[PDB]
């Protein structure tokens, strides 16, 4: 978010409108890895073995 | 009764149902439940790979 704010304060306004699709998909992609993803060493069970 | 209506559910019940759905689906087309290998999975994943490749290219175009 800081990068986007830094560019908007700088006045490029390149991310306006459809240009915003790049920051949007990245933010969502990060969200999938941190909240879902897969279990650790103490969570050996998973769909392929169960 | 039981099982009817919109009651609560858990994540193990969601995968459990998807297992029964895959197993019953092949029983209609191959007439056996042995499920030595699971070809239904692979055929579905191949389409998802196809769609993803389409999205990557048009996003590449927008970047251009």
mmCIF file of C-alpha atoms in Angstrom:
data_model
loop_
_atom_site.group_PDB
_atom_site.id
_atom_site.type_symbol
_atom_site.label_atom_id
_atom_site.label_comp_id
_atom_site.label_asym_id
_atom_site.label_seq_id
_atom_site.Cartn_x
_atom_site.Cartn_y
_atom_site.Cartn_z
ATOM 1 C CA UNK A 1 0.000 0.000 0.000
ATOM 2 C CA UNK A 2 2.935 2.292 0.721
ATOM 3 C CA UNK A 3 4.234 1.898 -2.839
ATOM 4 C CA UNK A 4 0.831 2.891 -4.272
ATOM 5 C CA UNK A 5 0.567 5.878 -1.901
ATOM 6 C CA UNK A 6 4.132 6.949 -2.755
ATOM 7 C CA UNK A 7 3.325 6.919 -6.499
ATOM 8 C CA UNK A 8 -0.007 8.732 -5.939
ATOM 9 C CA UNK A 9 1.647 11.446 -3.848
ATOM 10 C CA UNK A 10 4.297 11.710 -6.579
ATOM 11 C CA UNK A 11 1.428 12.463 -8.983
ATOM 12 C CA UNK A 12 1.851 9.768 -11.636
ATOM 13 C CA UNK A 13 -1.842 8.765 -11.425
ATOM 14 C CA UNK A 14 -0.988 5.740 -13.573
ATOM 15 C CA UNK A 15 -2.877 3.319 -11.259
ATOM 16 C CA UNK A 16 -6.213 5.073 -11.723
ATOM 17 C CA UNK A 17 -9.095 3.146 -13.270
ATOM 18 C CA UNK A 18 -8.297 -0.192 -14.913
ATOM 19 C CA UNK A 19 -4.602 0.388 -14.231
ATOM 20 C CA UNK A 20 -5.406 -0.600 -10.597
ATOM 21 C CA UNK A 21 -5.781 -4.304 -11.548
ATOM 22 C CA UNK A 22 -2.067 -4.955 -10.860
ATOM 23 C CA UNK A 23 -1.969 -3.930 -7.153
ATOM 24 C CA UNK A 24 -5.379 -5.572 -6.644
ATOM 25 C CA UNK A 25 -4.453 -9.085 -7.864
ATOM 26 C CA UNK A 26 -1.118 -9.059 -5.967
ATOM 27 C CA UNK A 27 -2.817 -8.147 -2.678
ATOM 28 C CA UNK A 28 -5.270 -11.032 -3.200
ATOM 29 C CA UNK A 29 -2.476 -13.449 -4.146
ATOM 30 C CA UNK A 30 -0.601 -12.673 -0.923
ATOM 31 C CA UNK A 31 -3.806 -13.224 1.055
ATOM 32 C CA UNK A 32 -4.219 -16.800 -0.232
ATOM 33 C CA UNK A 33 -0.710 -17.883 0.823
ATOM 34 C CA UNK A 34 -0.863 -16.425 4.361
ATOM 35 C CA UNK A 35 -4.345 -17.494 5.472
ATOM 36 C CA UNK A 36 -4.906 -20.815 3.678
ATOM 37 C CA UNK A 37 -1.840 -22.507 2.180
ATOM 38 C CA UNK A 38 -0.797 -25.735 3.893
ATOM 39 C CA UNK A 39 -0.159 -27.169 7.348
ATOM 40 C CA UNK A 40 3.210 -27.582 9.037
ATOM 41 C CA UNK A 41 5.175 -30.435 10.587
ATOM 42 C CA UNK A 42 2.595 -31.033 13.327
ATOM 43 C CA UNK A 43 -0.137 -31.224 10.635
ATOM 44 C CA UNK A 44 0.979 -34.217 8.535
ATOM 45 C CA UNK A 45 -2.594 -35.026 7.443
ATOM 46 C CA UNK A 46 -3.655 -33.591 4.084
ATOM 47 C CA UNK A 47 -6.081 -34.204 1.237
ATOM 48 C CA UNK A 48 -3.650 -36.416 -0.760
ATOM 49 C CA UNK A 49 -3.027 -38.849 2.144
ATOM 50 C CA UNK A 50 -6.410 -38.776 3.911
ATOM 51 C CA UNK B 1 -35.328 -35.567 10.252
ATOM 52 C CA UNK B 2 -31.529 -35.364 10.336
ATOM 53 C CA UNK B 3 -29.237 -34.050 7.621
ATOM 54 C CA UNK B 4 -32.064 -31.983 6.131
ATOM 55 C CA UNK B 5 -32.086 -28.187 6.041
ATOM 56 C CA UNK B 6 -29.319 -25.570 6.245
ATOM 57 C CA UNK B 7 -27.473 -26.578 9.453
ATOM 58 C CA UNK B 8 -23.826 -25.840 10.298
ATOM 59 C CA UNK B 9 -20.889 -27.786 8.845
ATOM 60 C CA UNK B 10 -17.107 -28.265 9.182
ATOM 61 C CA UNK B 11 -14.089 -28.481 6.851
ATOM 62 C CA UNK B 12 -13.750 -32.281 7.243
ATOM 63 C CA UNK B 13 -17.357 -32.672 6.118
ATOM 64 C CA UNK B 14 -16.589 -30.602 2.999
ATOM 65 C CA UNK B 15 -13.701 -32.827 1.860
ATOM 66 C CA UNK B 16 -15.598 -35.938 2.903
ATOM 67 C CA UNK B 17 -18.426 -35.040 0.536
ATOM 68 C CA UNK B 18 -16.044 -34.302 -2.359
ATOM 69 C CA UNK B 19 -14.548 -37.777 -1.951
ATOM 70 C CA UNK B 20 -17.968 -39.463 -2.218
ATOM 71 C CA UNK B 21 -18.819 -37.290 -5.233
ATOM 72 C CA UNK B 22 -15.677 -38.319 -7.161
ATOM 73 C CA UNK B 23 -16.141 -42.007 -6.301
ATOM 74 C CA UNK B 24 -19.816 -42.035 -7.344
ATOM 75 C CA UNK B 25 -19.110 -40.111 -10.555
ATOM 76 C CA UNK B 26 -16.785 -42.760 -11.997
ATOM 77 C CA UNK B 27 -19.194 -45.531 -11.006
ATOM 78 C CA UNK B 28 -21.591 -44.199 -13.640
ATOM 79 C CA UNK B 29 -19.026 -44.076 -16.477
ATOM 80 C CA UNK B 30 -16.652 -47.009 -15.731
ATOM 81 C CA UNK B 31 -18.847 -49.398 -13.697
ATOM 82 C CA UNK B 32 -16.209 -50.163 -11.041
ATOM 83 C CA UNK B 33 -15.132 -48.499 -7.796
ATOM 84 C CA UNK B 34 -11.599 -49.895 -7.585
ATOM 85 C CA UNK B 35 -10.272 -46.425 -8.544
ATOM 86 C CA UNK B 36 -6.771 -47.728 -9.196
ATOM 87 C CA UNK B 37 -5.933 -44.235 -10.510
ATOM 88 C CA UNK B 38 -8.130 -41.184 -10.483
ATOM 89 C CA UNK B 39 -8.420 -39.864 -14.041
ATOM 90 C CA UNK B 40 -11.329 -37.525 -13.246
ATOM 91 C CA UNK B 41 -9.030 -35.301 -11.196
ATOM 92 C CA UNK B 42 -6.413 -34.984 -13.947
ATOM 93 C CA UNK B 43 -8.917 -34.170 -16.691
ATOM 94 C CA UNK B 44 -10.381 -31.371 -14.537
ATOM 95 C CA UNK B 45 -6.969 -29.944 -13.563
ATOM 96 C CA UNK B 46 -5.948 -29.819 -17.239
ATOM 97 C CA UNK B 47 -8.790 -27.376 -17.966
ATOM 98 C CA UNK B 48 -7.771 -25.200 -14.985
ATOM 99 C CA UNK B 49 -4.240 -25.137 -16.407
ATOM 100 C CA UNK B 50 -5.726 -24.063 -19.760
ATOM 101 C CA UNK B 51 -7.743 -21.211 -18.218
ATOM 102 C CA UNK B 52 -4.762 -19.972 -16.187
ATOM 103 C CA UNK B 53 -2.589 -19.880 -19.312
ATOM 104 C CA UNK B 54 -5.261 -17.739 -21.002
ATOM 105 C CA UNK B 55 -5.364 -15.255 -18.091
ATOM 106 C CA UNK B 56 -1.563 -14.981 -17.932
ATOM 107 C CA UNK B 57 -1.367 -14.050 -21.632
ATOM 108 C CA UNK B 58 -4.072 -11.358 -21.573
ATOM 109 C CA UNK B 59 -2.628 -9.868 -18.364
ATOM 110 C CA UNK B 60 0.685 -9.818 -20.219
ATOM 111 C CA UNK B 61 -1.050 -7.885 -22.996
ATOM 112 C CA UNK B 62 -2.447 -5.295 -20.557
ATOM 113 C CA UNK B 63 1.059 -4.752 -19.178
ATOM 114 C CA UNK B 64 2.234 -4.005 -22.730
#
